[PDB]
Amino acid sequence: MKSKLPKPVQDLIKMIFDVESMKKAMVEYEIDLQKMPLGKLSKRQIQAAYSILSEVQQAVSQGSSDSQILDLSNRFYTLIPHDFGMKKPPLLNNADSVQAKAEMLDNLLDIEVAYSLLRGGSDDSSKDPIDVNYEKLKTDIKVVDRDSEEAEIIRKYVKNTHATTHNAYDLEVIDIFKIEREGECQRYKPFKQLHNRRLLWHGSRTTNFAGILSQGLRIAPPEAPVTGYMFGKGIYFADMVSKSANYCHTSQGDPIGLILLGEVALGNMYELKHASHISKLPKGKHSVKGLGKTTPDPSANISLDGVDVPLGTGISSGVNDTSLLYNEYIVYDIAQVNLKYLLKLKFNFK
Numbered sequence: 001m002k003s004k005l006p007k008p009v010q011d012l013i014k015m016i017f018d019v020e021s022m023k024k025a026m027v028e029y030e031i032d033l034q035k036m037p038l039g040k041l042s043k044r045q046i047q048a049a050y051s052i053l054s055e056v057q058q059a060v061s062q063g064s065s066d067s068q069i070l071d072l073s074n075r076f077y078t079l080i081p082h083d084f085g086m087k088k089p090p091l092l093n094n095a096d097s098v099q100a101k102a103e104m105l106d107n108l109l110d111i112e113v114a115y116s117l118l119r120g121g122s123d124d125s126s127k128d129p130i131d132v133n134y135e136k137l138k139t140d141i142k143v144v145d146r147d148s149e150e151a152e153i154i155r156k157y158v159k160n161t162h163a164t165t166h167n168a169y170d171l172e173v174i175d176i177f178k179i180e181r182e183g184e185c186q187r188y189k190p191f192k193q194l195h196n197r198r199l200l201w202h203g204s205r206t207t208n209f210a211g212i213l214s215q216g217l218r219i220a221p222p223e224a225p226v227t228g229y230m231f232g233k234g235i236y237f238a239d240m241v242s243k244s245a246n247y248c249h250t251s252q253g254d255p256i257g258l259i260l261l262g263e264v265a266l267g268n269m270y271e272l273k274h275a276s277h278i279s280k281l282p283k284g285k286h287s288v289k290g291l292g293k294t295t296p297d298p299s300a301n302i303s304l305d306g307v308d309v310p311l312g313t314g315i316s317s318g319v320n321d322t323s324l325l326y327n328e329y330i331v332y333d334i335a336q337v338n339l340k341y342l343l344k345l346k347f348n349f350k
């Protein structure tokens with residue numbers, strides 16, 4: 001049979017299950033595709049690589065000998081083979097090196113999820129492969145009509161919350177998808193009664209979306225290094241589309257990105273101006289709000305189905321004694337997020 005899914009949904013499935021994009025991402029990370037093909041990637045190996053990186057992070061802060069750091073570096077490259085070619089393997093002896101490798105592992109974890117979903121399941125012929133891969137996402141995906149009131153609100157949110165400092169590109173909404181992850185409604189239900197529910201942005205690389213749709217937004221595993229997380233291991237969101245759009249890591253070569261709109265149950269926010277490098281919340285607080293110098297104009301805030309949409313144009317906040325240019329929101333429980341929309345964006349670079 002032929003797929004009855006709308007063309008934009010079919011194009012989304014092709015985009016998130018693109019094997020060539022998975023291979024190109026591994027080539028960019030300088031992974032040796034002969035020693036470590038896409039089909040050889042495993043959960044166990046990525047888990048053990050995170051543990052090695054945490055040992056490196058501990059050794060660097062402890063002030064361990066260069067011989068122990070070299071041994072941990074060598075063990076990491078043995079577990080994740082790299083092909084540097086003309087270069088000596090960079091030593092993992094600083095915070096920047098461990099963070100670049102932890103970023104690679106986060107992306108490899110979701111690439112492994114996408115490839116294992118794609119290669120799994122009943123390899124029959126009765127159903128269209130696009131329908132088969134659609135079902136592997138365990139997510140209901142519907143197209144939001146361009147002429148709808150919903151689409152108008154979302155386009156206004158994209159237009160008004162583009163930061164002045166992120167002038168490398170213009171954003172254009174291609175498609176708006178309404179999404180419903182299986183079991184997420186039931187999971188979110190206890191938090192639906194928490195106050196201060198906001199519709200916020202979450203950007204990520206396109207190669208992570210098969211993992212995000214099938215498993216939802218997740219928190220970094222305990223084995224992962226604690227470094228590089230301004231407010232600890234949690235799920236981070238922005239109220240400025242361009243702050244999250246930067247995490248799509250789109251380029252002139254591939255200017256099509258995916259961004260989420262999630263309803264997040266913030267409750268009582270723990271308002272911070274500087275890095276806390278801690279995941280523990282004070283009693284009675286349900287989230288962290290990192291305070292930026294620029295905030296969406298609160299007078300243009302709208303309430304949609306009991307959820308605040310801060311689609312106001314970026315104005316000065318009043319805080320100048322902060323390390324953040326824009327706000328960010330962090331929750332430490334995966335159940336405090338209900339994914340609502342998925343946008344396909346065109347990045348028009350200057």
Ligand SMILES: NC(=O)c1cccc2cn(-c3ccc([C@@H]4CCCNC4)cc3)nc12
Nearest residue numbers: 102103201202203228236237238244247328
């Ligand atoms: N992804 C986002 O849309 C987003 C919005 C606002 C603030 C954000 C902060 N992040 C974020 C992204 C990545 C990380 C680390 C850094 C590299 C190692 N593992 C993850 C920490 C924070 N992402 C944000």
